[PDB]
Symmetry: D2
């Protein structure tokens, strides 16, 4: 084996170490070729055909770029080839646990199918990695290239999921703390995963990326902070970091939480729920699993991809009729209809335990308007989206360390007020989207009256088109006009 | 219904007439979301996740751009909204007939599975279109927007496949001949289909596109030629057209005929052949079809997509064991091994009827070299690739008409010698690639000796690495050194 | 004359009407080829070689695109070819009044050379346009293409500079009010001038543009607002518009107000001041003007371009020695040294009449630190930069009208709270940069102590590197640590 | 001093070693900011505002990239930091000798102004470099960073201009021969200068670049050839190299030799000739030089830039009236008129000594057509352009060495027949453009008849529009029809 070159449209010609090639050329990794990065987003942005596979290559490549750059600027860090490979592998492998349609699976489907369980793609990534290594005889190959499986496998997993439980990490000591900031940055979210997806998603979406990660890499240094060696950014680059998060939020607003992309994810989730009892996936020793239980056996999970969607759509089994009909409505574009969007007011905040009760509230609103049809709870979908800068109410730039050019080894902190008054005063918010499952003209007219009445009753913000869609409702509320 | 905007990364925001939206929002069209544009190319160029769906939107959009541009410059043509919609629809629908992995299906699989039949994706596109229209009640909608289904459906089909049988076309008269040059140009190959794929494939492959179709559109005019109204290009743009074909050939060399992408297509084709007797696809009236017979029923063909690959890979049926093993070798990257490439010499040309005999010739070559293993015909794959400028030996620019700025209505012809001495003297060639199905070191060493000996025996060109891979063979041939 | 095609790297092949070509092919327009768009920015961003000429073509092109798009969607507007040409000409010509190094000239040099006068590039553009028309016999040509010079010339000028004095405009009636929003939008700043420069500046700077103007054009409509017909944006696009201004501000922060680009502009301005008494420019009737007086005669102004810089640099006249020495320091990169940046606190705001007093305040600060040198007022430069969303304290989105898809003819308003909590709470701020003209190590050390002491005395924000550059000063201030 | 980062739109963030910064920040280098890369090309392609300065940075950067890549792949080469800096400096400095409007100066102006002398920009680059070093005290700084001025300055100059006189180079021994292939490749033309300009010129022109230099860098290796260590390319990349030269030729055809860009260069050259006796440039010791003699004194040459054009255009001196009038015709776009283009037939080849006689031949042609005006030799311009693959009749790929993957250290040769039949059979040709200085309708009509008659008399190829512009002339020639 010698090193391979891959041509990526985002990053150009990437060199892959033979050990990485060996990890990549497994069923567990190749699986990511059949999982769309953006799930239902492809049904709205037709350029978004890209899959988790190529994103993972890019994350692995950027992880290598950063660790290499730091080692070249600061030989005193003693970054070894072994460290580089471990960081690259963690980069490559942090998406292994994604399910069909990526975030739809762990964001919508598992929560509803297995409410008692707490599962994340991160957990899944660790499990799949363990399975990948064991199933494919990778430990010997790691040894051949100077890695120490006991320590290094632990390191890799900690990079992905954090401490598997003071310095809480075992795979590397505090002297190498900065290595944990590269692939999945638990402190402030600034990691090479974002950098690849910003660039790649934009390339495919037809939206232009505002963040320059190569510049950031050039200005990054390691400095001592509170007895840890941490990655620090040049002080004057602080604006670029606020911009990075602004970019992320804009991508969510325009693409990842697109009102129609979300309703398609919701419809697909509904079909999966209705198919769950009848689709069988063979795991370890020939034992059969369901869509919702494949997460318990990585052999089965390996075979759980976007292909599930087509298996359902092309099924003839009468058991799968209801699931198959939902997917067919997607193909004819007979989708649940968007009614509108609103936000809570003041401090008001909506908890996950209350999500299920919301369609019922909308249906209970009693607008003083003439209605041909009366709508029930089950006719309404209410999608609640938490938007933030990756840390709920917290400002992630308050968790970033900087250095100045006159003292490159001395870490400092920068407050929001030292940067600009034009920055946000809050860093988290909720959006509520309401959809109606009844798509005819009269139902939709009615749904609009309920929705706007409910906004008024709850003292939510005025929907943007409120006066046009519900002119008889909006005048009752002084604050709106 | 009103017009929709779609954001395409190649063309930007494209407007779609509601009738086009109706055609698009059918199972027959949406199917193209699950067929990779470049087939096995994705297994070499990881950016090439793109599917035929989005390419078809682009072709439909460009077809509209060109017909609109001509109408705006020359009102005297009397191009109607009806003409525009018909040309857009033909553009949208000329890829409907592609099968799993696009050109792998009609270029490799069908020729081997059903040797007696002549089938093309073009034929398939017409059949699928008819099925699309009838299955979805589109004729009434066409009438609602001013189309005349009898004439216009005929027109659309002729744009895709040519005369369904002097002026040989029935869907439009000679006065509108130029409309037939837009979507699928049978005279010289210069059409909007190429223009989309150059741009789109380059964007995804990470290769840069050298042809400017927007410029071409600006300089296009309709002029009278031999009692037909034909699209003519500005004389000075002739170099750009030679460049267009040069670009196409370069894309084939670098990407579409990549030696490994082709062997992957070949391996997938082999798996499909071994699965063909056991995979069943439900068509009209519940009747069951095979992969190779789904082309006879469009209802079944609608459900024949790349998903077949994963159906096989994830199968547990022992009948599909051999097919499934081939796909598993792809995932582990245990691929048939490339041995080398060579070309015929002089006038020598290789016909399709002789393809099957070639592995046998390679195995019959008797290199005077010491060999541990002896290889048989079935161990060798010989892939013969015809490279041309789209017209076999013919120069397509000899079939283009031009105009000069001093007389914009007067069509003229341009010879190669009026353009440049730096153009090719021939416009067609064949490449022969040889691969070995036995992948071990000793088999591959042997395969190299056979291959190079066979090249010498047949008086083919010297493989580039011939002296290195077969130093004991190459000296016998004077011409090579 | 017939229409010309120009290839622009930003917009592609642009068609120019022959009348526009005639306006372009004059000394008054061609002059823009020798004025850098970004002035001193080229000395920091080497890709920023671009000149106002090519920007002006782009603004003229986009002005045409928008007016065409509106006319195509709404024939009821009665937009004529005459209206289109007038809007294009205003677009082409709104940059005619720029001086050497663009905003350096009217932002720094004229204010200091002719403090009593109020001049702007806008005024200059009108004057230069009048001169262009009269000097080149353009009125007859305008008549030949259906324009009415009396009304249309007035219209064009009003599009550039606003009312030359209710409906305050004379060139077109209220029915055509929306035409005034295209080239230079006085109501909210959203115009095609921004759109070209975002795209063009980013292309040359090596920074990526976040705003999609083509999308905006597709969703724009004209609706009635307060008895005017105004351009309205689709409601859901409101986020994109906030993003547009965010992008503008980011471009200012990264490029247009780059600390070193600004000091170069300042040094060039200083050289121009020292050269002003000696450089002579011939205007009308052979009369001689100065750099600072060329604005009074358009014949002289025509010959006032970036070339002035080189005329000074290459001069041998001993009178110009001091000016020439400043420019030579630029070439050797011996620039005034950046000391730091800070901002006012709370409501504090700094007026233009106080700018001159600021170096004196810095020099008067008395840091308790050991200093080798003592610095004087004239050793300090204080640059005050007003950053906003184009309307001082005002939110420009409050001055935008929207429409919803259920009632496309009905204009509505959207408040900030209807959009997001993650938007700025303020829309204007000031940055203060301090530089030292003494560049040696000890002077700069001292300058840092004065600067930080002055920030502390004035209760400005703590400079980012304050603790590193002035560790003995920063502890006295509680608020900073 | 520490290393600086510059943001280039083509290459991104480039790091500059402090020694390079010191070389850059001199009047001799900064001069390149005022010399357009493409000369008169900007007057046809408005995006082509770029100057030689930024190109030189890119060449210096790519030179560094390649030498670094080779050192990283092959430590055994013993490439030192000293070698890297020398190669970077040669890259940075190979354009120092360009004059106003780049190739216009040494391609058109000097040959006509000083016919007896042989001068090239290469020679000029060496002289300017020597002047840069000596004028700015760079030798001590070189020593400070480990360079040995005696050997290294010699090396740098040899990289630029070749041997200043068996191994003919003195700055480095044969073991380092491959270092001479990087900045200016005298063996086959494949160097980093091309790579920058392809990318940069395309970015500005609005034409898309077909060559991937990063890929080439990845596949480059050093191998022994004929007792030299040379840079070798991977065998299979041979097609990419043919494509590189094809791209270069296409860029010449579309842009660098654009018929109107060339006539603008020609008109500027004419103005310079008429201004040459009156413009004075101060050189060493206050001595005065002319445009045409500034090449003899680098102090004067330092001040000779594109600014000369504006000095002439803005002059009031009656001596410069004729020169100034030519430039004014450019501004009004009253340009010499293109008549047509033709090529020699067979082996026919046109020598430089015969260029002056050609307008006289055109004027002597006696077309049997009715003419209002009779034209004289001085009314015609004949521009002869030699197009090749950089080596006259020779195929540069015959002078490239390759390696195969089975033996990466073993250099091999590849013939054209081993690559493709679709390649050119010849690698050089001449284009002849004829223009008329009399621009009225009747003169141009006449000029066309003379031109086509002269083509017929000389047995040149038929102009493309010949039948349209000269219908009464073309029938006499059988071969043409
Ligand atoms: N001319 C090209 N330009 C850009 N990318 C290319 C080109 N040819 C191939 N690629 C892409 C496809 C792959 O992603 C990557 C590696 O391809 P390539 O170098 O052909 O690998 P290979 O494995 O076929 O070569 P090798 O024969 O040495 O193993 O580069
Ligand atoms: N709701 C969604 N809809 C569509 N795509 C999504 C959604 N959520 C995430 N994605 C996609 C887009 C991104 O490229 C990618 C981000 O998720 P992932 O790659 O797991 O990193 P992450 O979990 O750290 O995300 P983040 O950057 O938000 O922290 O997944
Ligand atoms: N082959 C090409 N590909 C891309 N852009 C080009 C090409 N040739 C020219 N351009 C650019 C340069 C100009 O901005 C614009 C117009 O060029 P061109 O068509 O040659 O005008 P022209 O005035 O010389 O031709 P004509 O003889 O038609 O008047 O296009
Ligand atoms: N925010 C930015 N984003 C992208 N590129 C930038 C940005 N700021 C500057 N550049 C570019 C322009 C310059 O050519 C190059 C260096 O600029 P910059 O880092 O500001 O150096 P500088 O010398 O002004 O700062 P300092 O000397 O404090 O390090 O990078
Ligand atoms: Mg390989
Ligand atoms: Mg919609
Ligand atoms: Mg022209
Ligand atoms: Mg700096």
């Amino acid at each position: 084996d010698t090193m391979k070159v891959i041509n990526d449209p985002i990053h150009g010609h990437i060199e892959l170490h033979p050990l990485l090639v060996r990890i990549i050329d497994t069923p567990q990794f190749q699986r990511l070729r059949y999982i769309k990065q953006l799930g239902g987003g492809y049904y709205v942005f037709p350029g978004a055909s890209h899959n988790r596979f190529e994103h993972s290559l890019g994350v692995g490549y950027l992880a290598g770029c950063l660790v290499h750059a730091l080692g070249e600027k600061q030989p005193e860090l003693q970054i070894s080839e072994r460290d580089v490979l471990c960081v690259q592998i963690a980069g490559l492998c942090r998406n292994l646990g994604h399910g069909p349609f990526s975030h739809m699976f762990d964001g919508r489907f598992i929560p509803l199918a297995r409410p008692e369980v707490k599962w994340t793609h991160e957990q899944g990534s660790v499990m799949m990695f363990e399975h990948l290594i064991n199933s494919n005889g990778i430990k010997p190959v790691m040894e051949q290239y100077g890695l120490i499986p006991e320590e290094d496998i632990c390191f890799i997993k900690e990079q992905i999921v954090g401490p598997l439980e003071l310095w809480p990490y075992k795979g590397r000591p505090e002297n190498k703390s900065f290595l944990y900031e590269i692939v999945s940055n638990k402190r402030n979210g600034i990691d090479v995963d974002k950098w690849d997806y910003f660039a790649r998603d934009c390339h495919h979406l037809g939206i232009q990326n505002n963040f320059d990660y190569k510049r950031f890499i050039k200005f990054a240094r390691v400095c001592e902070v509170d007895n840890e060696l941490r990655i620090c950014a040049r002080d004057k680059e602080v604006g670029n970091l606020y911009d990075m998060f602004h970019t992320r939020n804009s991508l969510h607003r325009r693409a990842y939480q697109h009102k129609v992309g979300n309703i398609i994810d919701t419809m697909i989730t509904d079909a999966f729920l209705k198919a769950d009892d009848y689709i069988e996936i063979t795991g370890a020793g020939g034992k059969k699993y369901r869509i919702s239980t494949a997460i318990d056996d990585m052999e089965a999970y390996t075979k759980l991809t976007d292909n599930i969607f087509l298996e359902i759509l092309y099924s003839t089994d009468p058991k799968l009729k209801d699931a198959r009909e939902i997917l067919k409505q997607i193909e004819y574009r007979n989708l649940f209809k968007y009614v509108g969007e609103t936000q809570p007011t003041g401090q008001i905040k909506i908890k996950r335990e209350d999500y299920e009760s919301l369609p019922k509230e909308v249906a209970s609103a009693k607008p003083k308007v003439l209605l041909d049809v009366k709508l029930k709870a089950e006719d309404f979908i209410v999608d609640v989206i938490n938007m933030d800068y990756g840390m709920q109410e917290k400002n992630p730039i308050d968790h970033v360390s900087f250095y100045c050019k006159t003292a490159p080894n001395r870490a400092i902190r920068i407050t929001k007020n030292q940067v600009s008054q034009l920055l946000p005063e809050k860093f988290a918010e909720q959006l509520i989207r309401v959809y109606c499952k009844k798509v005819d003209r009269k139902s939709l007219y009615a749904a609009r009256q309920y929705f706007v009445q409910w906004c008024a009753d709850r003292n939510f913000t005025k929907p943007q088109d409120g006066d046009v869609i519900a002119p008889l409702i909006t005048p009752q509320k002084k604050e709106w006009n």
